[PDB]
């Protein structure tokens, strides 16, 4: 039944109109300055970068999405095997369902069978931390897939509008996270889920020992929109209320600036509406360490292995083109390349006390 | 015949296209910063707040609309009984008609019969203060409904274009108001009617002892538009002139900033185009103490008691969602939550000498 | 044949699409702050103001348009007789045609016959000053209609694209103007003709002793468009070039700011696209002493006397409404009333070195 | 086969939708201040200017486009003969094809036969400098057309997406260029090709002795678009990636500001999307020494000699009109005339550290 929601989620995300519905990443407001003389050759471009104690081929990750049933595990298989081939890290979807039901475990475990070397990231929702889950559940999630880290997702916006939603975010959960991070053999990443991380949230999480963030800003997959559709579907009145919140959240680009600024030493994934290698390039240039993607990886995976391979080739090429055209020989250079910030993103930063000079020094 | 205009008013407002016609609240320019980690649970959210000497359930009020005839009193009945059930304060429409005609009294008195505990707000138009009305008419309006305060409405824009309009706003009217407030057992609120309160108007009213404002800015019910329709209807040439003024006024958001800034200790209702709980939340976050609504309450009430209940539930849920998603456990926390001001609202404030730093300290 | 151009001009202006074609006044960027408590009554509003040594009923003038043939004189008759009735000043069109041809004189003289008291403004084009015209031609123009002043028009943009155009603006013409102003019994106004006066032009003219300006900015009648149409009409290749210049010029609102700022003591008419009393009020509030109108007066006059009366009633009402709703009891109060400048007009002023603070003090 | 690409290029550029596709010059953000009193006569306007050691009639050049085959040479003939007639300088297309194939030489040599006096500009791509080309190939390109200068084009964006593209821009190429410039009898211009020159690229090139730049910014011919079409055509998957980059680059107007600011003493051609004499006027006023055009010259040339003559007449007239209407008697006065910078261009400059005051002094 939670397994039913899991299938609905995938199905609405993949086949309904929810990608960037009434929302925006603000990435249009970020421009990478073109360099007519790059000072490099396309083939000397190096996209390698660190992901905790591993090295990855490309500063892009697949962020967590699914699992909990066979056809979901078959998707997870296709993602993992292609991700392995390309040397790119992969998060799995929430493993709650696999803690609750042993039959769901294989649909997550398959990932490490087929992807023995890339970093694999576990997944549990923050609401579970106030509702009982602790160190052991974490370790179970981790060891079930021999994870190199665990993502704990923030999704209060989704919980609020979800028909069976659990909108529980008492501060107690953070004390518990901080305790759990004491005893855990792998690092914790805290990630949003389409509504983005603000500087207040990031600073709070940092004061509790969290150093790793995944922005998951608005403008990509709209989870409020997904839950609105679930509400429409079962005649729940919450639907029209969700409609008013469709553009709620921190835009991805704003979130990248906010986290990088307020926690300069953070390890930062920039995600939420990353749809090309250009987007990936802007996110990293803006301040992220890596770019994250979910929805378009799902869509390709559903079409098949080769379709997903073609997708990744395209992203990689697009990334390397932005690198080439900015004179960025490696990921480090991309992080310090020249940008222009315009429009609404500019105004958002000014209002939020983000001094653009100290910001340029911070991102490098 | 004034009774006739009362019916026309309700009819055009309810059934014609006058809500936000060529006007804007500027509320799009106000963004509430999303908090991925709220630090609270949805069910611990407390929406209680003070309304003079009473406590109300929710920082929303129904602002004055109608009365003066039976079908109008039946509307007033539906609004009051539902308002009572929800613990939300209700203003009545202008009581002028009930001073002039004793048959109209019941359509206002019904309100206290059916709503014995919530705050009820009396209503008289400022033009009447230069045209004879004083202490005794105020007390009649007040005691006719056992009001907890009296709203005095400003509507010069309406009076200008009204076919039978009385555009009389001599300063003598404020001298009188200030005298009347000496002798009155309840506080006075001064409210606009779709065209908003500026810092000049607010400062002037304050210098006459007025401490309670209701912004009633543009972007909601367009009273110029209503009067234009009345003019078109009776071939009056004023109609085309009204058309040029459709976007005249201080937008609600700008008005909230203006009043809060220029009179920091004011008790402020933010109204004019509040259409959702999100709207209500933005207005409070911006600087209002409570949000006000009129037109959508009318529209629901006309559909029936249960429709109006469903409406209020929706508003309340929406409000609580905005509070949840900003980490606001109570109304006080909402007033100090993080916001972004962009666009035309930003430019309005900059031009008007509203320093954004001293503004942030003021709204707290 | 110049008389032919005169009818073509009136015909294209009146019946073709040239009013604000691809151009803008920027008056959208000017907002008059609404006052919910005006502090005055509509009927105590006083719209009287000085126009040189005369008093006029309303701070609006009809700026020069036509003359030179019978049906043109009949239009001039209708404008003058209605202007007389309302106590509003009237400029006539260029009197060049009547210096060149004695048969054309009656079509200008008719104006003083039928309007014995209002200020009447003569008209000659600046190119004529480099092409022979001097003191005597000026006195003829003036005494032909017992003018209270003479308007010398700037129209180089028009002359450039006019098929028979005379784009001659040597500085010599200003030396001559300054000499002519020595000997003249009435003051000189320098006015543009749909392309606006900049601070460079206004300072230059002032340095030659010109104190009276009429902005005639873009966003109203488009004279480049009119000449383009004349070019299309006679297969002249200049037509497509004109098309690229359709939005050439200083927008009316920018021109008002520019002139007022760079020559603070100027007597300033704000015109070019004034279409309502609201427009008229913005131009005055912005910094003009009076608002000017041409095209919509022409259009009404062509429909007839009573149509033009209805037009002027409408303008006056609209003006008084803007006065009422800003608490402006008289024209002076309107000149110092509260405004907001937004958008492109704000950017224009910032770039041009118009300090908004010293600007507010200057317009008062 | 390189000769095949040469005809494809011309064919797609002339007949497909690639001019300003999803791109912008930012020239809309630049406004020339209209002068109602120019202080000059249209016929005294002098458009003569220097182009290295020659004098040219008009501050406009035709920038390099084509050559390499007969029907291409016949185009080059039409361009050169008309350019000769008007006294405007002409660049030829890349001469690579004529170094590689002796049969292609005539299609470039024809230019000097028919245009013995105007400046003619040679052309070689930067990629060729990394791939073997040196002093002798340069001299062959120069002497083949008795060139007055050689343009070295930057096109890494095009190379990246070109199906047979050579995206090689190692810094080694600049050491080589600086060496070649030692031994060369004519000066070197470095020009972009639709994607614009940034301050980083311009400062780099200057450090290597390059003093002459041609912006070729975005907003005109979109070379990424042309290669996208070539990719679509041969089913190459790079096509969809190109689609994401259609708006990549420095907008022409931004590029002009960037180069002029970061190398104040540069000789600067402003090109990319120059489509009228007004555009040409803005680019010069902004900071360029001359305006450059390619695409619309090609399109006219294909129609024929007389069509191209009519084109140039129109450009010249448009230029002189902008000069007339700003009071610019000669090209120098145009360079210091009054402008307004608004919008996105303004934001671009502010972010890039272009101080608008020091900028106004630098362009004069
Ligand atoms: C079908 C599906 C299912 C999920 C997700 C996504 C989608 C598309 N996402 C959120 C995801 O990881 C990401 O943070 C947001 O989707 C924003 O990225 P995109 O715009 O989708 O690239 C997600 N997040 C997570 O932490 N736990 C979860 O189980 C899921 N579930
Ligand atoms: C039919 C109807 C009738 C009235 C009103 C409204 C409507 C819709 N309003 C104005 C109202 O209280 C409020 O200030 C404005 O309508 C702006 O809020 P809304 O945009 O309608 O929520 C109103 N105001 C008041 O002070 N006295 C009055 O009697 C009336 N009459
Ligand atoms: C048919 C017609 C004829 C003329 C004009 C106008 C029209 C519509 N205008 C220009 C006019 O006075 C005014 O400056 C501009 O038209 C801008 O104002 P409007 O937008 O038309 O109100 C004009 N100006 C002037 O100084 N001398 C002239 O003879 C004329 N001729
Ligand atoms: C058909 C064709 C072919 C070429 C070009 C253009 C066109 C239209 N351009 C680029 C040109 O010189 C210019 O820099 C850009 O086209 C931008 O200017 P326009 O927007 O076209 O005026 C060009 N540039 C160059 O340096 N070498 C080349 O051979 C070509 N080839
Ligand atoms: C986008 C996300 C984070 C999907 C998880 O939503 P759920 O609320 O269905 O996740 P669990 O309850 O199964 O953790
Ligand atoms: C929107 C408002 C304020 C309605 C009141 O209009 P009226 O002008 O009919 O009010 P009274 O004259 O009855 O006070
Ligand atoms: C809009 C205006 C100023 C009309 C005058 O144009 P003309 O150029 O025909 O005027 P004269 O030559 O008759 O002065
Ligand atoms: C816009 C430009 C610079 C066209 C040159 O493209 P190519 O890449 O076809 O030029 P060559 O290889 O022939 O130099
Ligand atoms: Mg959950
Ligand atoms: Mg009234
Ligand atoms: Mg003339
Ligand atoms: Mg090449």
GROMACS .gro file of N, CA, C and O and ligand atoms in nm, chain D residues 6 8-14 18-20 25 62-67 92-95 108 122-125 151-155 158 191-195 214-223 226 252 271-275 292-298, ligand 4:
model
  279
 1098UNK      N    1   3.129   2.456  -4.712
 1098UNK     CA    2   3.122   2.594  -4.761
 1098UNK      C    3   2.992   2.627  -4.833
 1098UNK      O    4   2.931   2.730  -4.803
 1100UNK      N    5   2.699   2.446  -4.810
 1100UNK     CA    6   2.597   2.424  -4.704
 1100UNK      C    7   2.584   2.546  -4.614
 1100UNK      O    8   2.474   2.596  -4.595
 1101UNK      N    9   2.697   2.593  -4.560
 1101UNK     CA   10   2.701   2.711  -4.478
 1101UNK      C   11   2.626   2.826  -4.541
 1101UNK      O   12   2.533   2.877  -4.483
 1102UNK      N   13   2.666   2.865  -4.661
 1102UNK     CA   14   2.600   2.976  -4.730
 1102UNK      C   15   2.449   2.949  -4.747
 1102UNK      O   16   2.366   3.038  -4.727
 1103UNK      N   17   2.415   2.824  -4.782
 1103UNK     CA   18   2.278   2.785  -4.811
 1103UNK      C   19   2.186   2.792  -4.686
 1103UNK      O   20   2.078   2.851  -4.691
 1104UNK      N   21   2.231   2.733  -4.576
 1104UNK     CA   22   2.159   2.740  -4.449
 1104UNK      C   23   2.149   2.884  -4.396
 1104UNK      O   24   2.043   2.930  -4.355
 1105UNK      N   25   2.261   2.956  -4.400
 1105UNK     CA   26   2.262   3.095  -4.355
 1105UNK      C   27   2.163   3.180  -4.435
 1105UNK      O   28   2.089   3.259  -4.377
 1106UNK      N   29   2.162   3.164  -4.567
 1106UNK     CA   30   2.078   3.247  -4.653
 1106UNK      C   31   1.931   3.209  -4.648
 1106UNK      O   32   1.844   3.298  -4.653
 1110UNK      N   33   1.801   3.113  -3.915
 1110UNK     CA   34   1.915   3.111  -3.822
 1110UNK      C   35   1.963   3.246  -3.775
 1110UNK      O   36   2.056   3.252  -3.698
 1111UNK      N   37   1.899   3.353  -3.820
 1111UNK     CA   38   1.941   3.488  -3.784
 1111UNK      C   39   1.875   3.530  -3.654
 1111UNK      O   40   1.755   3.562  -3.652
 1112UNK      N   41   1.952   3.534  -3.546
 1112UNK     CA   42   1.899   3.570  -3.413
 1112UNK      C   43   1.811   3.463  -3.346
 1112UNK      O   44   1.733   3.495  -3.257
 1117UNK      N   45   2.115   4.041  -2.930
 1117UNK     CA   46   2.230   4.131  -2.933
 1117UNK      C   47   2.236   4.223  -2.810
 1117UNK      O   48   2.342   4.281  -2.783
 1154UNK      N   49   3.200   4.500  -4.448
 1154UNK     CA   50   3.150   4.365  -4.467
 1154UNK      C   51   3.252   4.265  -4.405
 1154UNK      O   52   3.371   4.265  -4.442
 1155UNK      N   53   3.208   4.184  -4.309
 1155UNK     CA   54   3.298   4.087  -4.245
 1155UNK      C   55   3.297   3.959  -4.327
 1155UNK      O   56   3.204   3.935  -4.407
 1156UNK      N   57   3.403   3.880  -4.309
 1156UNK     CA   58   3.428   3.763  -4.391
 1156UNK      C   59   3.317   3.659  -4.391
 1156UNK      O   60   3.256   3.633  -4.287
 1157UNK      N   61   3.292   3.601  -4.507
 1157UNK     CA   62   3.189   3.498  -4.519
 1157UNK      C   63   3.228   3.376  -4.602
 1157UNK      O   64   3.232   3.264  -4.552
 1158UNK      N   65   3.256   3.397  -4.730
 1158UNK     CA   66   3.264   3.284  -4.818
 1158UNK      C   67   3.378   3.288  -4.918
 1158UNK      O   68   3.463   3.376  -4.913
 1159UNK      N   69   3.377   3.190  -5.007
 1159UNK     CA   70   3.483   3.164  -5.104
 1159UNK      C   71   3.511   3.014  -5.106
 1159UNK      O   72   3.477   2.942  -5.010
 1184UNK      N   73   3.706   3.863  -4.654
 1184UNK     CA   74   3.665   3.745  -4.727
 1184UNK      C   75   3.643   3.630  -4.627
 1184UNK      O   76   3.686   3.640  -4.510
 1185UNK      N   77   3.578   3.524  -4.673
 1185UNK     CA   78   3.565   3.402  -4.594
 1185UNK      C   79   3.697   3.330  -4.569
 1185UNK      O   80   3.801   3.367  -4.625
 1186UNK      N   81   3.694   3.227  -4.485
 1186UNK     CA   82   3.815   3.151  -4.453
 1186UNK      C   83   3.884   3.104  -4.580
 1186UNK      O   84   3.821   3.045  -4.670
 1187UNK      N   85   4.014   3.133  -4.587
 1187UNK     CA   86   4.094   3.095  -4.702
 1187UNK      C   87   4.159   2.957  -4.690
 1187UNK      O   88   4.234   2.915  -4.778
 1200UNK      N   89   3.865   3.378  -5.439
 1200UNK     CA   90   3.911   3.484  -5.346
 1200UNK      C   91   3.983   3.594  -5.420
 1200UNK      O   92   3.963   3.711  -5.390
 1214UNK      N   93   4.196   3.951  -4.525
 1214UNK     CA   94   4.216   3.806  -4.527
 1214UNK      C   95   4.151   3.733  -4.408
 1214UNK      O   96   4.109   3.795  -4.310
 1215UNK      N   97   4.145   3.601  -4.418
 1215UNK     CA   98   4.077   3.519  -4.321
 1215UNK      C   99   4.132   3.377  -4.309
 1215UNK      O  100   4.138   3.300  -4.407
 1216UNK      N  101   4.170   3.343  -4.186
 1216UNK     CA  102   4.207   3.207  -4.151
 1216UNK      C  103   4.151   3.176  -4.012
 1216UNK      O  104   4.145   3.265  -3.925
 1217UNK      N  105   4.111   3.050  -3.992
 1217UNK     CA  106   4.066   3.006  -3.862
 1217UNK      C  107   4.180   2.979  -3.766
 1217UNK      O  108   4.282   2.923  -3.804
 1243UNK      N  109   4.218   3.861  -4.082
 1243UNK     CA  110   4.130   3.830  -3.971
 1243UNK      C  111   4.158   3.687  -3.933
 1243UNK      O  112   4.163   3.599  -4.019
 1244UNK      N  113   4.180   3.663  -3.804
 1244UNK     CA  114   4.190   3.526  -3.751
 1244UNK      C  115   4.065   3.502  -3.670
 1244UNK      O  116   4.040   3.570  -3.571
 1245UNK      N  117   3.983   3.407  -3.713
 1245UNK     CA  118   3.855   3.390  -3.649
 1245UNK      C  119   3.860   3.292  -3.535
 1245UNK      O  120   3.931   3.192  -3.541
 1246UNK      N  121   3.785   3.323  -3.429
 1246UNK     CA  122   3.760   3.231  -3.318
 1246UNK      C  123   3.621   3.171  -3.338
 1246UNK      O  124   3.523   3.246  -3.353
 1247UNK      N  125   3.611   3.038  -3.338
 1247UNK     CA  126   3.482   2.971  -3.353
 1247UNK      C  127   3.469   2.838  -3.271
 1247UNK      O  128   3.414   2.737  -3.321
 1250UNK      N  129   3.117   2.687  -3.263
 1250UNK     CA  130   3.088   2.618  -3.388
 1250UNK      C  131   3.164   2.484  -3.401
 1250UNK      O  132   3.104   2.383  -3.436
 1283UNK      N  133   3.866   3.807  -3.461
 1283UNK     CA  134   3.720   3.821  -3.464
 1283UNK      C  135   3.653   3.694  -3.412
 1283UNK      O  136   3.706   3.585  -3.430
 1284UNK      N  137   3.536   3.708  -3.350
 1284UNK     CA  138   3.460   3.589  -3.311
 1284UNK      C  139   3.372   3.550  -3.429
 1284UNK      O  140   3.393   3.598  -3.539
 1285UNK      N  141   3.275   3.462  -3.408
 1285UNK     CA  142   3.189   3.422  -3.518
 1285UNK      C  143   3.049   3.388  -3.470
 1285UNK      O  144   3.000   3.276  -3.494
 1286UNK      N  145   2.985   3.484  -3.403
 1286UNK     CA  146   2.846   3.466  -3.357
 1286UNK      C  147   2.833   3.444  -3.208
 1286UNK      O  148   2.722   3.441  -3.156
 1287UNK      N  149   2.944   3.432  -3.137
 1287UNK     CA  150   2.938   3.408  -2.993
 1287UNK      C  151   3.011   3.509  -2.904
 1287UNK      O  152   3.001   3.500  -2.780
 1306UNK      N  153   3.711   4.211  -3.344
 1306UNK     CA  154   3.579   4.219  -3.402
 1306UNK      C  155   3.487   4.132  -3.314
 1306UNK      O  156   3.504   4.010  -3.305
 1307UNK      N  157   3.390   4.196  -3.248
 1307UNK     CA  158   3.310   4.131  -3.144
 1307UNK      C  159   3.235   4.009  -3.194
 1307UNK      O  160   3.236   3.907  -3.127
 1308UNK      N  161   3.169   4.020  -3.309
 1308UNK     CA  162   3.085   3.912  -3.359
 1308UNK      C  163   3.010   3.842  -3.245
 1308UNK      O  164   3.028   3.723  -3.218
 1309UNK      N  165   2.927   3.920  -3.175
 1309UNK     CA  166   2.850   3.867  -3.064
 1309UNK      C  167   2.726   3.789  -3.105
 1309UNK      O  168   2.690   3.784  -3.224
 1310UNK      N  169   2.660   3.728  -3.007
 1310UNK     CA  170   2.533   3.662  -3.035
 1310UNK      C  171   2.421   3.760  -3.069
 1310UNK      O  172   2.425   3.877  -3.036
 1311UNK      N  173   2.320   3.709  -3.136
 1311UNK     CA  174   2.202   3.787  -3.164
 1311UNK      C  175   2.187   3.806  -3.312
 1311UNK      O  176   2.084   3.852  -3.358
 1312UNK      N  177   2.292   3.771  -3.386
 1312UNK     CA  178   2.291   3.777  -3.531
 1312UNK      C  179   2.290   3.637  -3.583
 1312UNK      O  180   2.214   3.553  -3.534
 1313UNK      N  181   2.376   3.609  -3.681
 1313UNK     CA  182   2.386   3.475  -3.738
 1313UNK      C  183   2.424   3.380  -3.627
 1313UNK      O  184   2.521   3.403  -3.554
 1314UNK      N  185   2.344   3.275  -3.612
 1314UNK     CA  186   2.366   3.178  -3.504
 1314UNK      C  187   2.436   3.055  -3.559
 1314UNK      O  188   2.374   2.969  -3.624
 1315UNK      N  189   2.565   3.048  -3.532
 1315UNK     CA  190   2.646   2.941  -3.588
 1315UNK      C  191   2.623   2.805  -3.523
 1315UNK      O  192   2.631   2.700  -3.589
 1318UNK      N  193   2.337   2.686  -3.713
 1318UNK     CA  194   2.371   2.637  -3.846
 1318UNK      C  195   2.428   2.494  -3.837
 1318UNK      O  196   2.395   2.404  -3.916
 1344UNK      N  197   2.622   4.084  -2.863
 1344UNK     CA  198   2.702   4.187  -2.928
 1344UNK      C  199   2.725   4.312  -2.841
 1344UNK      O  200   2.841   4.352  -2.822
 1363UNK      N  201   3.019   4.382  -3.435
 1363UNK     CA  202   2.936   4.301  -3.525
 1363UNK      C  203   2.865   4.183  -3.456
 1363UNK      O  204   2.896   4.148  -3.340
 1364UNK      N  205   2.775   4.122  -3.532
 1364UNK     CA  206   2.688   4.019  -3.482
 1364UNK      C  207   2.551   4.080  -3.472
 1364UNK      O  208   2.517   4.143  -3.372
 1365UNK      N  209   2.470   4.065  -3.575
 1365UNK     CA  210   2.334   4.106  -3.567
 1365UNK      C  211   2.312   4.251  -3.600
 1365UNK      O  212   2.204   4.303  -3.577
 1366UNK      N  213   2.413   4.317  -3.656
 1366UNK     CA  214   2.392   4.453  -3.712
 1366UNK      C  215   2.305   4.444  -3.836
 1366UNK      O  216   2.344   4.383  -3.935
 1367UNK      N  217   2.183   4.499  -3.829
 1367UNK     CA  218   2.081   4.478  -3.935
 1367UNK      C  219   2.029   4.608  -3.999
 1367UNK      O  220   1.961   4.604  -4.105
 1384UNK      N  221   3.020   4.606  -3.815
 1384UNK     CA  222   3.045   4.500  -3.912
 1384UNK      C  223   2.916   4.427  -3.942
 1384UNK      O  224   2.834   4.411  -3.853
 1385UNK      N  225   2.898   4.386  -4.068
 1385UNK     CA  226   2.782   4.308  -4.113
 1385UNK      C  227   2.825   4.192  -4.202
 1385UNK      O  228   2.922   4.203  -4.279
 1386UNK      N  229   2.751   4.081  -4.195
 1386UNK     CA  230   2.778   3.968  -4.282
 1386UNK      C  231   2.649   3.919  -4.344
 1386UNK      O  232   2.621   3.953  -4.460
 1387UNK      N  233   2.570   3.844  -4.268
 1387UNK     CA  234   2.447   3.782  -4.320
 1387UNK      C  235   2.362   3.869  -4.415
 1387UNK      O  236   2.335   3.824  -4.526
 1388UNK      N  237   2.321   3.992  -4.374
 1388UNK     CA  238   2.228   4.062  -4.464
 1388UNK      C  239   2.298   4.107  -4.593
 1388UNK      O  240   2.230   4.130  -4.694
 1389UNK      N  241   2.431   4.119  -4.590
 1389UNK     CA  242   2.505   4.146  -4.713
 1389UNK      C  243   2.500   4.024  -4.804
 1389UNK      O  244   2.477   4.038  -4.923
 1390UNK      N  245   2.518   3.905  -4.749
 1390UNK     CA  246   2.509   3.780  -4.825
 1390UNK      C  247   2.372   3.771  -4.892
 1390UNK      O  248   2.364   3.743  -5.011
 1460LIG     C1  249   2.749   3.245  -4.485
 1460LIG     C2  250   2.842   3.298  -4.378
 1460LIG     C3  251   2.967   3.238  -4.367
 1460LIG     C4  252   3.059   3.283  -4.272
 1460LIG     C5  253   3.023   3.385  -4.182
 1460LIG     C6  254   2.895   3.440  -4.189
 1460LIG     C7  255   2.803   3.393  -4.282
 1460LIG     C8  256   2.666   3.454  -4.277
 1460LIG     N1  257   3.117   3.429  -4.085
 1460LIG     C9  258   3.081   3.501  -3.962
 1460LIG    C10  259   3.062   3.650  -3.990
 1460LIG     O1  260   3.183   3.707  -4.042
 1460LIG    C11  261   3.017   3.726  -3.865
 1460LIG     O2  262   3.127   3.730  -3.774
 1460LIG    C12  263   2.891   3.666  -3.800
 1460LIG     O3  264   2.809   3.613  -3.905
 1460LIG    C13  265   2.808   3.770  -3.725
 1460LIG     O4  266   2.769   3.876  -3.814
 1460LIG     P1  267   2.625   3.886  -3.882
 1460LIG     O5  268   2.526   3.874  -3.770
 1460LIG     O6  269   2.622   3.772  -3.982
 1460LIG     O7  270   2.623   4.024  -3.942
 1460LIG    C14  271   3.250   3.393  -4.102
 1460LIG     N2  272   3.347   3.441  -4.023
 1460LIG    C15  273   3.476   3.424  -4.056
 1460LIG     O8  274   3.558   3.475  -3.978
 1460LIG     N3  275   3.514   3.324  -4.139
 1460LIG    C16  276   3.426   3.253  -4.215
 1460LIG     O9  277   3.462   3.194  -4.321
 1460LIG    C17  278   3.281   3.287  -4.199
 1460LIG     N4  279   3.183   3.232  -4.272
   0.00000   0.00000   0.00000
